């Protein structure tokens, strides 16, 4: 029934969290000992451009043995987990500073910033920061100055603690004074229903994986949109690291500056990293680089053939079907895994009779299907036909041919040609997906989708074949019918 | 229009001047031809074209070669490697370096000139430099040479002055099923004459982190990589390196373990099997105390480094002697100046000063750096690209034995089969004239061969030609027949050929070559279709027009009902032979847990590119969600986005009795949905901001 | 083939121009003088410092450049920093020179500098990668695009545009064109645009402006706003001057309270500074600005305009001819935009742009600090601050449109080598037909970037010693006849 | 038929070239558009269409069977004509020769080259625009998912005018003729032109499925659709395929922009009060340039419909005659968050207060991928 959005309760997330909890408030960056520990938990640091030669590890990289999986490290107090599947969880937490009522959900700040913040006078800082300064004369717009005069005449008390304690009154006034001049009814309903989850006591710092620091021979490289997150976290740390303890007013002013920095980060990160063409959503949530795939140029199968069969080159067959061949080699020839892997990689660039026999046995064992199911993709993908399901029925015995031979009866549907067209092949791992991808079998684009009771023009024969037929059918090889009857 | 009148000459056409029939081809196809000649690698069977516009002579003047820039005097000749019979001897010397002096100069500038065995301005295509024997054997100290004297050049530059840009092929225009979608049907013997050569370099680094393995040695000899003149071993491995670990010495350092390459845990560099190594360069860091290389693993490394150090030491010695004699009067070229800088970077530094930290574009060198250059010859077979000189691009789609290709009644065997119908749809009719006129020209030369008593196909010998030239009446008659053909097909050529000083020599050349070469300038004043009509209605120069016989795709010997004409076409190979194919069953991931991109260091670690292919974009998932369905579409994505699901797929293949008939790969009860890393990252970021996406109740 | 046939074919075939075929970048960068043995690139460096000597304080001289020995070349690129000597072994085609300066007869510290070397076929290797350096076809003197006259100097680039203003003459409303240009850059950092007549009034007096150039005795024909200026009843230039004067006055009327103050000089400068930018700072600031403006016409730019036929010796003479002789280019241009005949193949102006930038900023530092005693230590620090080891070559493989990666699968030098031509529009990172393409370009060679055939160079083109494209007479008639039919 | 291969050579060219009537259509011609394109080209077309001429010729036999085309052949055997410059401007003088004879003078050769320059254009921008247009229309159309076979037995019909331009587009549509019986358009009912008929329409369906319709209301074109296919995607693909083919091969780019502005409401679809009044306007607009079936037209318009704008109910209306129209941007952000997360500016829906209020919403195929496969 579709998807909608909810509001999470941060302190409930805090309560249900498992493991020792690290708070960024308890860190003085000035002490060089504490800075190193802070960077241990915040950044995921890479000391060079060298490949990580480890599969599992603890937090502090003291244990890199896969047989110790699940054992808790004694130095970092972290269980040994498998990398590439490590759970994504907050790296730290932010407590409520001294003489501060509570924190603010960053979602509420982002919504308010859309309305309250203007080019000449923002209203959120005025209501929350006592150190914000303004010039009424400098305002050069009638609408904003009218709003400013109305707010000043109202006589509110500047301060974060006052703002949190009296929020219904301030929020109501913002609606009445036309400060929030859009979606007044919807915004009121949102606040009136989620007011119990808008002022948390703890806020989670994003995961260690989000912030990646790469140190090279030419300096350390960082992602610019991460900047606000670093600044927000350090700001809360400096509250208890100040040499002179901060007065309650100064504590609130610094707390609000940190919260305003968190709101800036999430909005900018969503705008710049989640929501764009090479973003998280459009590149990885709705797309992927798949395993067990191949890519090569194409040629034609012009000899008598079945329209839904495919021929792959020798080199593609060896690398694509590596684990299929390894299974056969171990069983038939009593090879070890090391020997089988060595045997397969050795014969990628040369013909081998034993490998060729195994290829046919793999194809013949795909019964009752003609061969191994696969899907062939042509880009750009617009119509049904640019994605088709074929069956691998033959691995070419000539190693100099590095093309995938395609049936000549299925070239019009994807508008495929032989001039530098690299197509993408995807191997189906099991029978369940082979049945599923039957929906894009070549026969599924035969019937026209433009005109009823008609066959699409994709089925028409190619030029060279038609010329041969008309050279035969329309030859004047017989006398006229009148002469035939004499 | 006054058919038979042309105004444009060579100076206004540009690269189009290489086409004698530019006027009969559409502008779109003419542009394609000019692009094509810039993408054509040199082949082994290249030869001069049958029809010449004269522009080939100019293009043969400007090629990348080795020259003497100015009138100079040879001072020193250096060889990189001492080819001899010594204990440490190399089979061949790759590079010869010449130091000369411009003695016709006020300042007597001293320069350097290198003479390698090849050149390569392309990523994966080059050519061999053929040394000029007369000049090469002369070269010695205290010898003077003239400006613009060629020492070595490519084999394309013929001695006559012509240029080899392609190979002439017998072509029949037929509608065989193998010609679908601009496909070519190629004779196997023809493809042996269109073989390109590729030159490439492999680089390895060893030292504090890893050591070389014994890939080319035996139980008594340690030889990490092949020598100069050797060939790459059949599996294609050039060299491999293993990590340093002392605690595993009884396992990883046995003589057997040093000979066995582990694909999973070692790192190798793989090239073309059977390729011949032609050059080696080694850089060593000598100020290491102690060297991390184990003893007995550097005999080959030291042998090449010692000879290389001697070569650079002599270069630096020569300059210092020159500087002593010509204080403030020594002028050197910019090339020589950079060469001396390289020598100082190579030789060790004096102990009084700090050592050098060598880098290659922000990459720090280890103790050893080895560079190996090898050359391989490619046999075109399938997916290779070809085109004529009229824009008719095509792809080789079928290869047949020589005995199966079409053959006419006179014994001519076709090299290619091309669909003729596409000519009318693209309006490149220069195809027709070269084919049609070449057929008439070829038949005329063969007819004179038979009339003289020679074999019409075999190349005649000197004894046969001498006897043929004895008869004068036939020689005079043969010359007139050639002139009569020239009058029809080439008017400008005909006028020049009227006053041939030695007509017998022209006839002798034609019989030996088996083809009369035709000069066809772009501004030739000839009516083309009037010439075609003359040839058809002629009793002398009418080309043979009959049936052909070939073996069809069913293995049956058949003969065509229609008359088929066989003629020549100038063909050239095009780049992108499809050698960059990719295929991988499992790929290496990132710390995040997703497939990673491939850098240059990992490009050659496998015989073929093992890269994950983005076969499911956002557009494809839009199409799959509608046809296949959202259900199965999510399964396909999760098998990669979730690394644990991918691990389940591999185990299913390995444990299955029939790996190609697995019912279900991922057991969704043991590994349920919800483990995809991109989705988990999406949920985590939104949760921190304070929101979550949920199903509507 | 028959040996006699080849000779007859060769006899009947014209030859290409060897300068273009062998590569013109090599001919323009590495050719050495027989007398002195110094190449073109080093001579170009000397000429750059000759035109910039007018901004040098007394006693400061440029002594030339010298070639460095390979030993010093090796020592400079392996200089020790942080107890480490980094050596880059990736092959490059570079050589080193020293820049010599002296102060009151005392030689200062030489400044080493790296320069690129080119080989046959416009080939150069930079940091292990091969490149091709192609010439750029550029306009000589000035360029016209759309109501704009672009004039490039060695230190500046100026564009001249047009605006219309209304003035009342003898009780009759009239419209005249006002030529303006933006010469100060903080004006861009900022309504009236800087008028050329306003600059004339800032330099000369209004009466002096009219009498010296227009030979008009302006008083106080009667011209008024829409204050009186009176001219005898017996020009277009004077009309433009009047229009610009009223264009300035109308939007700043408070400043001209008394008519006599019009003939002053400080008031015009105050108005100009308020346009660009406190009165005290403004008055002093422009007095330096007009000082630099009066010295902006370098010798090299003068010779370029001389070829076109402009004949200007001072920057004020150039402004006069823009308002008098080149004014019609703003609305009715008589120069064909699509032509390729009156252009020049230029190499060094685009190759040495970064070094030219350093030279200009060095001269500007002296101008900004006039009337100051210079110490040897201060000069040495200034020279080190501007002329560094890799100043000239630091962006060759970044944003230079005439340098491109090399990919040649065969041995030919012409096909994608010395026949590549770069248009002026793409020099730093189409048009209708013209018969000149058949003579200068290759109208059938149509790459994707330049489908009109102007991206390739005809190998038979006739080129002068300085790179000027000349016309071939033997094809003059046929080219001319086609051009008429193209526009008919 | 391996013995009956067709061949080409200069012998075939001579046969067509030497015909007396072909040789007369190249002499004594007025160098004008009328003289060349109509008189000279007319004579050659007459010869090529005579069944008694060129018997057994490879070139002509292919022309009769559709292998060749007269446009290319006329420019080869008759006068080439008037090529245009890169700015689509024509030249005063023509090319007085065909390709087979050749063009060997500087003026005519150069202007002919401009055709090759015109061939290569900024297709990179065209690809970018077409891909964006296709993606945008497909995402919204996918909200109409299923097509059920059968008949829903509705008394709601639709009154549509029938014209000479849209008669072909009505193929397969069931219309109620006299005596209250259903018949479907076969495409040759010329007597119906200029009248108004009562059609079974998508907007009148009463199928229980909240995002589906029955076969009868869709028309007989639904027989060709494979089982289980998203019917909305089919309509968008059909429209996108024809526009993309025309754009890449009045500019069709302006046509694509015109369709986009009309459907997405920025003479906008939101102006009209009922879908019945809007379909003939869109059908005439669509069928004037491309050929789009009425069934596809109804689906695209139906996707832009909402139940109640006042109460912010953006679900599809059922039946479709009780709904209103809405802009594209508001619909893509307020129907389902799964579809919203796949188009543009994904941060904006997260800030919208309406996204957090419990509402009845339709679903999108991308909903599953947002949750990673969970149900
Ligand atoms: Zn640990
Ligand atoms: Zn219905």
CSV table of C-alpha atoms in Angstrom, one decimal, chain B residues 4 47 86 172 196 275 390 411 539 581 594 663 677:
chain,number,residue,atom,x,y,z
B,4,UNK,CA,34.5,13.9,-68.6
B,47,UNK,CA,51.5,-3.8,-50.4
B,86,UNK,CA,80.8,-14.6,-22.5
B,172,UNK,CA,32.7,-11.4,-55.0
B,196,UNK,CA,49.2,-7.1,-37.0
B,275,UNK,CA,55.3,-13.7,-27.3
B,390,UNK,CA,35.3,3.6,-49.9
B,411,UNK,CA,40.7,-20.6,-61.3
B,539,UNK,CA,36.0,-8.4,-77.7
B,581,UNK,CA,36.7,-8.7,-23.1
B,594,UNK,CA,30.7,-4.0,-2.8
B,663,UNK,CA,17.2,-25.8,-8.2
B,677,UNK,CA,24.8,-3.0,2.2
